[PDB]
Design a protein around this ligand. Structure first.
Ligand SMILES: *[C@@H]1O[C@H](CO)[C@@H](O[C@@H]2O[C@H](CO)[C@@H](O[C@@H]3O[C@H](CO)[C@@H](O)[C@H](O)[C@@H]3O)[C@H](O)[C@H]2NC(C)=O)[C@H](O)[C@H]1NC(C)=O
Ligand SMILES: *[C@@H]1O[C@H](CO)[C@@H](O[C@@H]2O[C@H](CO)[C@@H](O[C@@H]3O[C@H](CO)[C@@H](O)[C@H](O)[C@@H]3O)[C@H](O)[C@H]2NC(C)=O)[C@H](O)[C@H]1NC(C)=O
Ligand SMILES: *[C@@H]1O[C@H](CO)[C@@H](O[C@@H]2O[C@H](CO)[C@@H](O)[C@H](O)[C@H]2NC(C)=O)[C@H](O)[C@H]1NC(C)=O
Ligand SMILES: *[C@@H]1O[C@H](CO)[C@@H](O[C@@H]2O[C@H](CO)[C@@H](O)[C@H](O)[C@H]2NC(C)=O)[C@H](O)[C@H]1NC(C)=O
Ligand SMILES: CC(=O)N[C@@H]1[C@@H](O)[C@H](O)[C@@H](CO)O[C@H]1O
Ligand SMILES: *[C@@H]1O[C@H](CO)[C@@H](O)[C@H](O)[C@H]1NC(C)=O
Lengths: 597, 194
């Protein structure tokens, strides 16, 4: 009779219809992702299309129950999720234009190629050509050519599209009562109407900047050290006080500094840890890898994988006959069906990735009992954080020795751990100012704070000031280097990686405390610790039925994001960098550039 | 001195969906519950009123055998007093129950790769079913106060939802063929012996 009762009944109808239709779509998508055939391309599309149509119909139907007369917080959550119409608040004309622009930019990124200045029929795509250059090449001119030509051939195409994309997405977001599209994205972290746990959309900005301020020392010392090493590798190119050149950072954008490891390893002779040879020497196959992942998760009290997981998952490259999409993925098809798709190689990289993806699966099985709409992480940063802490635990020498791959006569010293922590910082800490700055530039462009005529001009200022990176070629406003990354020209919020990095170390620290771990945090393995597993399941079982702040407090006992676990994980390498830089400039000047002579 | 349906019920072709469970009068005949209890693939063989093989030594007036199909989470409800989704909207066990509940998997046959929607439940009903009651009526549910003269739409839904049975389901969401043996015994002539 009341509005909340009718809304409860509407959602009851919706959940069952949705389980069936979403299972249809996921199975066709699997079909395709395992057994490539034009046919079940068509099946994936038709199934996903019926699913999309069902969602639009149920969203129009859901907007007929106002949240203003609904009290059950969980009901209000589900209805608010089904009510976010999105791009259907624009005119149909503007929605078709927005979608046209999105598809054009996506296919420009995926099909943008550059051809060498000596052979107009030999070209490289981003993946794999230019990526292989930027990840493996040590020659300066080859790297510079790759960088500049990717941003001029394909970025120049993306400039006007991105301008119109800004206009349309700001219209879309202002039409759903957000101040701009960036505020719309920040709406993921929003929590209203639960006393002691609320969280606003600008509070995300404030906490991101406040925690980044605390990260700044660790990053400045890492930057000065990487500069010392690269300047040893490129004397006539890098200034000892200037920014790092953009095209010598490891990948196409300087998103991760991991590929600089060869050029900056502190103790370049100390043996690095890799158990691949041992797995092959003890006759390990993919079956054995995933069995060990299952064993790890069981060791802390979690359930072992369902019989469906073993009957249905694709854990190897299925030969040459049928092609498959080998990107490691974890699938929750719903209705009790969990799978992993991974073309596993008997290596340590794939060994760690297996525990990462099985952590995804464990998270899915925990909140399986929640309603359909609340079967997800606490916010956009919880799944990947959960997956990361599994690789953290299973990578440690204590665990590798535990499962028989590493011999008990392995000597952990003060050099090999510095090599390890430096690789970890090159991957993890290295991406943090990059991510913060990129999403900040986006947030300002969406809020209207950067005029079009200054877009790139602001970008490369922000590159110089926050990240410590200078562009090797002056760029006027004909470019759109932001869009030259996968995540800007395909419409994805980026702050998720910053938040995920911080979350994963809060998790790992809280769990290692519950596991009574002595010593530095990075060495910790949470195996055989049912109390850590219980403390984690207390948050995994929630899904997104409680505020993300409350889910976080369930693990770490704190209600807000916090950098101190990151800095604690990296404190040994912090002090080591402070020592190594005693004969180096720490910081950077923003006005030096390789082209200004 | 004839034997009781033995294979007619258990080893059948297809079971009825749960909203329209068929009930068969198992009477005037000697039952083989002595040696059928020992087959043992059943995933839930629990008699909530009497001993399993001892009950041979006690004739009953009119054993009722109700046969239908559910899933593993639905099996937890075919129980006296348990009111989940299925024991209060289609087939409720009386609180004073005395008979048997036999449950086994059924994936191999009652689930088909592509959505066997033959087997259905009731999810909506104006009132909670009363002990040992069958409702099969396809009247549209009157959730919204508004008149829903056979109308299918806002706040009024088809009260029958089909299990989208499929092989690749979790053991809890999988099909289970399930038979309830209501043992009754009173002054009426007891002609079900063993
Ligand atoms: C990947 O998808 C293809 C596309 O269906 C699968 O090919 C199928 O392979 C099965 C045997 O493995 C065959 O089934 C045949 O189906 C036809 C049509 O229903 C039927 O008339 C035949 O008697 C037979 O049952 C057939 O080659 C083909 N089925 C089709 C075309 O529907 C392939 O098996 C899949 N790969 C995997 C991982 O199984
Ligand atoms: C908001 O709406 C939900 C949806 O109905 C309400 O939660 C419901 O609470 C009832 C009664 O406590 C639950 O029924 C219970 O079922 C269990 C079977 O597991 C049984 O053991 C109990 O005896 C009881 O009958 C029902 O599960 C639950 N709905 C769920 C969990 O989805 C809730 O009370 C409303 N308000 C708040 C503040 O949550
Ligand atoms: C999946 O988990 C079950 C439940 O814990 C495991 O069953 C245990 O198995 C060990 C060794 O096989 C026994 O010592 C325990 O007594 C069992 N306990 C229970 C409650 O069953 C099972 O081992 C796991 N699956 C497989 C295939 O090993
Ligand atoms: C987690 O517990 C298991 C069981 O005790 C440990 O594995 C055993 O270690 C002993 C001694 O090294 C050996 O007999 C076997 O290799 C294991 N199995 C059994 C049944 O004892 C395991 O080492 C523990 N985890 C860690 C990190 O030590
Ligand atoms: C033009 C138009 O009607 N747009 C709809 C609006 O009616 C509805 O209120 C909103 C969600 O609140 O979704 C949009
Ligand atoms: C690591 O151990 C060696 C052992 O002789 C020592 O000389 C060295 O000083 C230690 N580490 C550092 C950072 O100096």
């Amino acid at each position: 009779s009341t509005i909340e009762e009718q809304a409860k009944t509407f959602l009851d109808k919706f959940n069952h219809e949705a389980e069936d239709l979403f299972y249809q779509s996921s199975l066709a998508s699997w079909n395709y992702n395992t057994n490539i055939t034009e046919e079940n391309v068509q099946n994936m599309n038709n199934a996903g299309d019926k699913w999309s149509a069902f969602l639009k119909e149920q969203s129009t139907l859901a907007q007929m129950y106002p949240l203003q007369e609904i009290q059950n917080l969980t009901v209000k959550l589900q209805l608010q999720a089904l009510q976010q119409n999105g791009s259907s608040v624009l005119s149909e004309d503007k929605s078709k234009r927005l979608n046209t622009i999105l598809n054009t930019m996506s296919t420009i990124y995926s099909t943008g190629k550059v051809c060498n200045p000596d052979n107009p029929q030999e070209c490289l795509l981003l993946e794999p050509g230019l990526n292989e250059i930027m990840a493996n090449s040590l020659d300066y001119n080859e790297r510079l050519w790759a960088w500049e030509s990717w941003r001029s051939e394909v970025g120049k195409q993306l400039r006007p599209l991105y301008e119109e994309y800004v206009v349309l997405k700001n219209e879309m977001a202002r039409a759903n009562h957000y101040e701009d599209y960036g505020d719309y994205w920040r709406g993921d972290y929003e929590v209203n109407g639960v006393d002691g746990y609320d969280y606003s959309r600008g509070q995300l900005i404030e906490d991101v900047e406040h925690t980044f301020e605390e990260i700044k020392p660790l990053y400045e010392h890492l930057h000065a050290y990487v500069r010392a090493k690269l300047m040893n590798a490129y004397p006539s190119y890098i200034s000892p006080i200037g920014c790092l050149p953009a095209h010598l950072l490891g990948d196409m954008w300087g998103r991760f500094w991991t590929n600089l490891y060869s050029l900056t390893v502190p103790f370049g002779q100390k043996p690095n840890i890799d158990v691949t040879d041992a797995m092959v020497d003890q006759a390990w196959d993919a079956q054995r890898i995933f069995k060990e992942a299952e064993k790890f998760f069981v060791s802390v009290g979690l359930p072992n994988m369902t019989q469906g997981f073993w009957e249905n998952s694709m854990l190897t490259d299925p030969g040459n006959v049928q092609k498959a999409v080998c990107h490691p993925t974890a699938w929750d098809l719903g209705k009790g069906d969990f799978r992993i798709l991974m073309c596993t190689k008997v290596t340590m990289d794939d060994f760690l990735t297996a525990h990462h993806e099985m952590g995804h699966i464990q998270y899915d099985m925990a909140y399986a009992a929640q309603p359909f709409l609340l079967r997800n992480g606490a916010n956009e940063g919880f799944h990947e954080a959960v997956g990361e802490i599994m690789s953290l635990s299973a990578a440690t020498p204590k665990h590798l020795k535990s499962i028989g791959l590493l011999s008990p006569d392995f000597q952990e010293d003060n050099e090999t751990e510095i090599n390890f922590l430096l690789k970890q910082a090159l991957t993890i800490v290295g991406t943090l100012p990059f991510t913060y700055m990129l999403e900040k530039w986006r947030w300002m462009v969406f809020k209207g704070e950067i005029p079009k005529d200054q877009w790139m001009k602001k970008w490369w200022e922000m590159k110089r000031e926050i990240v410590g990176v200078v562009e090797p070629v002056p760029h006027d406003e004909t470019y759109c280097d932001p869009a030259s990354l996968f995540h800007v020209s395909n419409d994805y919020s980026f702050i998720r990686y910053y938040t995920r990095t911080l979350y994963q170390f809060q998790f790992q620290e809280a769990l290692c405390q519950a596991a009574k771990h002595e010593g530095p945090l990075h060495k910790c393995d949470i195996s055989n610790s049912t109390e850590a597993g219980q403390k984690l399941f207390n948050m995994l079982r929630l899904g997104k039925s409680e505020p993300w702040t409350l889910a976080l407090e369930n693990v770490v006992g704190a209600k807000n994001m916090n950098v101190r676990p990151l800095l604690n994980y990296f404190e040994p390498l912090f002090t080591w960098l402070k020592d190594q830089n005693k004969n180096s400039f720490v910081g950077w000047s923003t006005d030096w550039s390789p082209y200004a002579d | 001195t004839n034997l009781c349906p033995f294979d007619e019920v258990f080893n059948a072709t297809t079971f009825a969906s749960v909203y329209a469970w068929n009930r068969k009068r198992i009477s005037n005949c000697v039952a083989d519950y002595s040696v059928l209890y020992n087959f043992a693939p059943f995933f839930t063989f629990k008699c909530y009123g009497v001993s399993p093989t001892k009950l041979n030594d006690l004739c009953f007036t009119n054993v009722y055998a109700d046969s239908f199909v559910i899933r593993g989470n639905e099996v937890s409800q075919i129980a006296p007093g348990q009111t989940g989704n299925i024991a209060d909207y289609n087939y409720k066990l009386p609180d004073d129950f005395t008979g048997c509940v036999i449950a086994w998997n059924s994936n191999k046959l009652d689930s088909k790769v592509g959505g066997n929607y033959n087997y259905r439940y009731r999810l909506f009903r104006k009132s909670n079913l009363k002990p040992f009651e069958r409702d099969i009526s396809t009247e549209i549910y009157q959730a919204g106060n508004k008149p829903c003269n056979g109308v299918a739409g806002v706040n009024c839904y088809f009260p029958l939802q089909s299990y989208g049975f499929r092989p690749t389901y979790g053991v809890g969401h999988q099909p289970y063929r399930v038979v309830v043996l209501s043992f009754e015994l009173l002054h009426a002539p007891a002609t079900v012996c063993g």
